[PDB]
């Protein structure tokens, strides 16, 4: 959706945006695994375990 320049991070030393960018990806990934599990109409047990 958005392309950001890598060059700002080193000079600016705002590394927190990189870590967030990582964690957000993980935050999305879990959701994706839920979303597919909801699209497949899987049992509540597997959803609860995940």
């Amino acid at each position: 959706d958005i392309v950001l320049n890598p060059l700002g991070v080193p000079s600016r030393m705002n590394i927190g945006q990189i870590l967030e960018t990582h964690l957000g990806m993980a935050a999305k990934g879990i959701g994706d695994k839920i979303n597919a599990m909801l699209k497949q109409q899987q049992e509540v047990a597997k959803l609860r375990e995940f």
């Binding site: 890598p6 060059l7 700002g8 080193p10 870590l19």
Partner: protein, 1342 residues
């Protein structure tokens, strides 16, 4: 229309004010409220100032242009335009005289110094609290004597009417009118001749200057007391209608109303024969009201309106940042302008910018209207406006037609230097954001985080051609400050080229042999080969021959695929070595500079565009990204921290044992933590910079890492070593708000998390830096404005002045380090003398040759150590500089053209980098070479060593090539083991002196006796407690007996038979003298050898403030003392911390005398010989002393060296031409020693150009010229001392400049740039220069 040659300023006579006026204002009313019409005789009166509406009478009897010029009989309002209300002034006839506050309070008081009366007494007389005497007969009273009311009554009773005494402005005016200017001038000149006191001489000469100015100007002193008060035209003080029936009023209206009320009340009281007290009070109130109207707040509390804010007076209208000069005349709001947020246009060519279509339509509206009416689409202007408002398609086609080759000016604030405004051809774009070319951003200092830029439209043909030829971005590829390229690749552009030009040990397609760059591109785009694959490529390159024709050579070169693909875009003429390397920012900038020097402007522009395109494309293809894994932490970091903690624990235990002090403990802990930080940084960089790859043979090999952060930092695209350290190593020790370093550093990095404590510690530095930037901006701006104001007059006005004078340029070397090579300091300057091949008499470089790159290379080849170049400070041009003295135009490479405003360029070049400046016993030879000693006198001791008997001795190292690259200062009495001209090895160390000890040396061997060495009176002899040995100590004047003041302990040398020893080569006996607190280890009659030393005597701010102090020529706190004349030294008699020193010239009949506070460590001894400029006592050197003792070249060298030291420490590159320009502007004033046959007066301050021209014409007529000294004025004082009063008034201190110009009756000839900017005519620089020359022709013909 009515072209004027000058602007004259003088005092206004009452008759002059009446001549200006169109009527008397005698009512304190503005408008009737029943009818919104001005009052009959008020401040807005129609029959005094003009009609309210154009060509319409006030009563409406006449309402058309046919009645033009008719004065109505019913109401007396002339039928004319309303614009006359903007011009016509009025007047108020004051019932009592009132003193002008400017001529009373603006120091120095013009009335006070004209009458030789103290300011407080004149204030007391004016404000009706004391009397003054005007005329006296046989009475005891004296003229100008002040009398209290009781004293006045006593005098009246004693003498009746034989004496005249009055109060107030009437009395002051009577005193002023009753003064004979010529007689007073003659009497004051006689007194000045008779007087001996220097303070009396200064007062007398300033009073004589004031009186002579009054005589010459034609102004009368009594005009300083106002009898008629001018009234400003109503349109300049408008009565603006508001919502709700209220009227917004200017404060001037309130001030005038107060003055009119007081005046009318005083007149009524005078008519009714009111008592003396009431009329005196009313006169005082009228005086206060007029003072408030003229300059509110200068005396007493400023009168305030209902908002409790002081009312704005006329002085406030002229003065200040918000005054007319700076807000309305030197700068303006302009039509045909817009602004918007800027974005990147990466598709743009260098000469074009993306302009929004709506902005273009609005800005070019009149052009569109004209082109619509030309094509018959719109019959009238209203139809054209309706068409454009509807935004029809034909309107868009017309707009595309009108902007085709019409440049627009883009400007970003602050405009620190001239690159802040540049011209571009506009390409119309959709959207509301201006698109800016990436390469111009560095010159603009523009990023795309929210910047807004302003757009201006050149209207006239001359404006369009100036935009195209002078201001367009294609002409601005070199920085005028230093000559280096300013349109330089950055960010992604640099990273992409760096990624393109890097090699990998084993890569796809390694070892292939390519037909050319095209095959490399084919292999890369097909995926068959990597960019970093090492391959042999056939390359054809071109080189210019001696005739300038490109000769081609083809060869197979080891290269990478990316380097060949990049070579595809390189212009013909450049070597392949310019691309056969990993290209960082410096390499690309150097490549562009080489292209400009070899091939010119157009190939360089094309090359820059292609470089930008290629860098962007290959940075995109690289997919360079920053991830958390790229911040690699050393594995050694934890153990380094543990070792450092162990060391600090050991030091803590040692301190608890009491073995070390608290300060020593603090220093030791800081040192060990700094060492740990260095180790962590070294480990981080070592791990980052290298990676291991498997080569073609299957073996591990090290190569430069492709880590993203390392690639960004190494390429120079972004980042640095310190920032990488903070990311991947410990970010180090932090300073408290007071500047002291915290004992425990921030051990964590930014990839790791800082603790709460560490973050709180870092915030101190963060906020300190932010606030420092906030203040630094203001300081730098003030400095830049001062520099511009001092240098704005200077323009190149002739080709060659014919001066053989110049300055000597040598490489700047400090402490064995060559801080600046000669090539940088001499490139682009014109040789003042012919340079000879070293060691021969053959001419290597002829005189008057501009030293371009080839000449500098030739100078380097022959190893020339010093050159003599022409300087701006040495130019003989009057009212300008010649093109040869200035030298190369740094922005264009060639010699500077006539008409270039070099002063503004210099000021901008110095001021722009201001915000980057900070605001808040052993000598070891480093290189193999030979040793040379200068300003040295030497003796040999019994040990065979060398002792130096000179205090200005310099030690230099010379290489076999003939160059010198070391410099040191050798203290007096230092011992050296090497002779002059000897050879020394690398690392050899020779130095022997004590900084805490001042030695005393003897010439020849003999026996030493004592004279005037008597216990108690002068000395004390004792067996010391420290060692138990005999010792002699010399007492100070505050410690010895009073009777021994004239007895000075001395040492005398005798031979083996007791005969007095004479100094070799002289008849002077060998005698030595000991100062106070000196200690002599020897006894009476002990033997010494030749060159024997026996003496035991006891012994910061930089940055932008340093530059400001250097340019303001501020004296140091404890300036060094310099010998004023060459001669022999002698001492005198001291008293309470002061000493007298006498220098007897070798032949001069007048010995100089000086007084020295004895707390200064006097360097020279009583028997030494000195030369003018020699350091008598060490310390900071006052620039004024340097100018008056060593000369102009010395002071300019000192200022240039110091300013360049500051800038070079910060890393800024500014050519010395600009500092020399500022220095020349500082040396513009001279003082006269002997008038000779000229009309000047001794001690007067004149322009150096004027005295130079007068001496030239006198010598042409054979008369004796006037002798002069030169004065070093600071930039502020130099700006305020200009002959143009308009420029000085526009700069600062408007009241003082205006008052002095009014009393002096000055005439401004409008020679400078600022004056013509105020007037609104073409500046005498650039395209306008020729125009002014035509003026100079016509006034010559007339």
């Amino acid at each position: 229309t009515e072209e004027f040659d000058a602007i004259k300023i003088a005092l206004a006579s009452p008759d002059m004010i009446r001549s200006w006026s169109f009527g008397e204002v005698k009512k304190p009313e503005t408008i009737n409220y029943r009818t919104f019409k001005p009052e009959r005789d008020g401040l807005f009166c129609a029959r005094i100032f003009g009609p309210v509406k154009d060509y319409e009478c006030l009563c409406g009897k006449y309402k058309r242009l046919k009645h033009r010029g008719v004065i109505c009989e019913k109401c007396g309002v002339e039928v004319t335009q309303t614009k006359v209300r903007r011009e016509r002034m009025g007047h108020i006839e004051l019932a009592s005289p009132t003193a002008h506050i400017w001529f009373l309070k603006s120091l120095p008081s013009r009335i006070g110094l004209l009458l030789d009366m103290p300011l407080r007494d004149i204030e007391r007389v004016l404000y009706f609290e004391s009397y003054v005497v005007i005329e006296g007969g046989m009475t005891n009273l004296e003229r100008q004597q002040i009398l209290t009311e009781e004293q006045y009554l006593d005098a009246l009773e004693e003498f009746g009417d034989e004496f005249d005494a009055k109060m107030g402005a009437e009395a002051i005016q009577a005193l002023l009118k009753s003064m004979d200017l010529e007689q007073e001038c003659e009497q004051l000149r006689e007194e000045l001749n008779e007087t001996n006191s220097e303070t009396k001489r200064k007062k007398l000469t300033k009073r004589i200057k004031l009186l002579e100015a009054f005589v010459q100007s034609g102004n009368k002193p009594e005009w300083m007391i106002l009898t008629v008060l001018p009234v400003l035209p109503p349109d300049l003080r408008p009565l603006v209608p508001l919502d709700g029936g209220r009227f917004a009023t200017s404060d001037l209206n309130d001030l005038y109303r107060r003055v009119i009320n007081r005046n009318n009340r005083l007149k009524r009281l005078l008519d009714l024969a009111a008592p003396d007290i009431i009329v005196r009070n009313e006169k005082r109130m009228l005086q206060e009201a007029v003072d408030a109207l003229l300059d509110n707040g200068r005396r007493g509390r400023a009168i305030t309106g209902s908002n409790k804010r002081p009312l704005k007076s006329l002085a406030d209208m002229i003065k200040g940042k918000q005054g007319r000069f700076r807000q309305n005349l030197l700068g303006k709001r302009v039509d045909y302008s817009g602004r918007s947020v800027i974005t990147v246009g990466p598709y743009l060519r260098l000469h074009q910018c993306g302009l929004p279509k709506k902005m273009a339509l609005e800005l070019f509206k009149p052009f569109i209207y004209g082109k619509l009416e030309l094509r018959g689409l719109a019959t009238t202007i209203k139809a054209a406006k309706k068409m454009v408002e509807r935004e029809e398609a034909v309107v868009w086609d017309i707009l595309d037609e009108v902007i085709r080759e019409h440049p627009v000016l883009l400007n970003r604030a602050p405009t620190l230097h001239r690159l802040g405004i540049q011209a571009f051809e506009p390409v119309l774009i959709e959207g509301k954001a201006i698109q800016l070319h990436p390469l111009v951003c560095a010159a603009y200092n523009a990023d795309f985080d929210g910047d807004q830029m302003a757009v201006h439209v050149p209207l006239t043909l001359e404006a369009q051609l100036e935009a195209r030829a002078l201001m367009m971005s294609t002409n601005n590829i070199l920085s005028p400050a230093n000559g280096e390229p300013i349109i330089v690749p950055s960010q992604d552009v640099v990273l992409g080229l760096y990624y393109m030009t890097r090699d990998c040990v084993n890569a796809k397609g390694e070892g292939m042999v390519l037909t050319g760059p095209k095959e490399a591109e084919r292999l890369y785009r097909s995926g068959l080969a990597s960019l970093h694959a090492r391959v042999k490529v056939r390359i054809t390159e071109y080189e210019k021959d001696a005739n300038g024709e490109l000769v081609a050579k083809t060869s197979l070169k080891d290269t990478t695929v990316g380097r060949a693909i990049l070579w595809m875009i390189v212009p013909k003429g450049l070597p392949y070595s310019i691309v056969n390397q990993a290209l960082g920012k410096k390499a690309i900038s150097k490549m562009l500079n080489t292209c400009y020097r070899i091939l010119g402007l157009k190939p360089t522009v094309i090359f820059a565009d292609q470089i930008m395109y290629t860098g962007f494309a290959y940075a995109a293809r690289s997919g360079a990204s920053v991830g958390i894994d790229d911040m690699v932490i050393p594995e050694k970091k934890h153990e380094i921290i543990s070792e450092a903690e162990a060391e600090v624990a050991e030091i803590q235990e040692q301190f608890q044992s009491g073995l070390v002090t608290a300060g020593e403990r603090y220093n030791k802990v800081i040192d060990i933590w700094a060492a740990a930080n260095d180790r962590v940084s070294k480990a981080m960089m070592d791990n980052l910079q290298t990676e291991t790859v498997i080569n073609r043979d299957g073996q591990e090999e090290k190569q430069v890492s492709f880590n993203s952060i390392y690639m960004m930092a190494d390429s120079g695209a972004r980042g640095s070593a310190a920032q990488i350290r903070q990311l991947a190593g410990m970010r180090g020790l932090m300073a408290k708000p007071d500047g002291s370093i915290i004992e425990t550093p921030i051990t964590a990095n930014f990839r790791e998390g800082l603790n709460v404590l560490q973050y709180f510690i870092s915030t101190h530095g963060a906020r300190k830096g932010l606030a420092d930037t906030a203040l630094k901006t203001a300081n730098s701006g003030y400095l830049t404005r001062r520099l511009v104001d001092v240098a704005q007059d200077l323009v190149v006005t002739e080709d060659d002045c014919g001066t053989h004078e110049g300055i000597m340029m040598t490489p700047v070397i400090e402490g064995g380090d060559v801080k600046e090579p000669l090539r940088d300091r001499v490139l682009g300057r014109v040789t003042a003398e012919d340079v000879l091949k070293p060691g021969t008499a053959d001419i290597l470089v002829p005189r008057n040759t501009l030293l371009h790159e080839q000449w500098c290379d030739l100078l380097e080849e022959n190893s020339v150590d010093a050159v003599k170049v022409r300087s701006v400070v040495s130019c003989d041009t009057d009212f300008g500089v010649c093109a040869h003295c200035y030298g190369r135009d740094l922005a264009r490479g060639h010699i500077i053209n006539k008409g270039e405003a070099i002063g503004v360029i210099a000021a901008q070049s110095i001021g722009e980098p201001g915000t980057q400046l900070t605001m808040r016993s052993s000598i070891q030879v480093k290189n193999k070479g030979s040793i040379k000693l200068s300003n040295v006198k030497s003796v040999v001791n019994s040990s065979g060593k060398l002792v130096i008997t000179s205090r200005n001795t310099e030690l230099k190292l010379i290489d076999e090539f003939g160059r010198t690259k070391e410099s040191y200062k050798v203290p007096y009495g230092a011992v050296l083991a090497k002779g002059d001209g000897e050879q020394v090895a690398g690392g050899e160390t020779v130095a022997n002196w004590d900084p805490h000890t001042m030695p005393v040396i003897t010439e020849v061997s003999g026996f030493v006796r004592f004279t005037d060495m008597i216990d108690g009176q002068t000395i004390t002899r004792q067996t010391d407690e420290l060692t138990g040995l005999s010792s002699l100590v010399v007492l100070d004047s505050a410690e010895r007996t009073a009777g021994g003041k004239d007895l000075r302990p001395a040492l005398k040398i005798v031979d083996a038979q007791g005969n007095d020893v004479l100094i070799p080569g002289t008849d002077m006996p060998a005698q030595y003298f000991l100062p106070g607190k000196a200690i002599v280890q020897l006894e009476d009659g002990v033997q010494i050898s030749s060159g024997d030393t026996l003496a035991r005597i006891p012994q910061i701010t930089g940055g932008l403030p340093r530059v400001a102090d250097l340019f303001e020529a501020r004296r140091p706190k404890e300036p060094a003392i310099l010998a004023e004349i060459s001669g022999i030294v002698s001492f005198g008699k001291e008293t309470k911390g002061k000493r007298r020193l006498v220098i007897t010239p070798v032949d001069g009949s007048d010995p100089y005398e000086e007084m020295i506070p004895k707390w200064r460590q006097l360097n020279v001894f009583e028997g030494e010989r000195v030369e003018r400029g020699d350091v008598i006592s060490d310390g900071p050197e006052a620039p004024h002393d340097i100018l008056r003792l060593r000369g102009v070249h010395a002071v300019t060298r000192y200022i240039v060296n110091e300013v360049q030291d500051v800038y070079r420490l910060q890393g800024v590159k500014i050519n010395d031409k600009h500092i020399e320009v500022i220095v020349r502007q500082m040396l513009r004033k001279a003082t006269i020693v002997n008038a000779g046959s000229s009309d000047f007066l001794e001690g007067e301050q004149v322009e150096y150009s004027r005295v130079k021209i007068a001496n030239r014409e006198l010598e042409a007529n054979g008369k004796v010229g006037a002798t002069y000294s030169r004065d070093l004025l600071g930039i502020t004082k130099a700006s305020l001392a200009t002959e143009s009063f308009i420029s000085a008034a526009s700069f600062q201190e408007t009241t003082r400049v205006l008052t002095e110009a009014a009393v002096a009756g000055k005439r401004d000839e409008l020679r400078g740039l600022k004056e013509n900017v105020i007037v609104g005519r073409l500046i005498p620089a650039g395209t306008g220069y020729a125009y002014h020359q035509d003026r100079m022709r016509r006034r010559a013909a007339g």
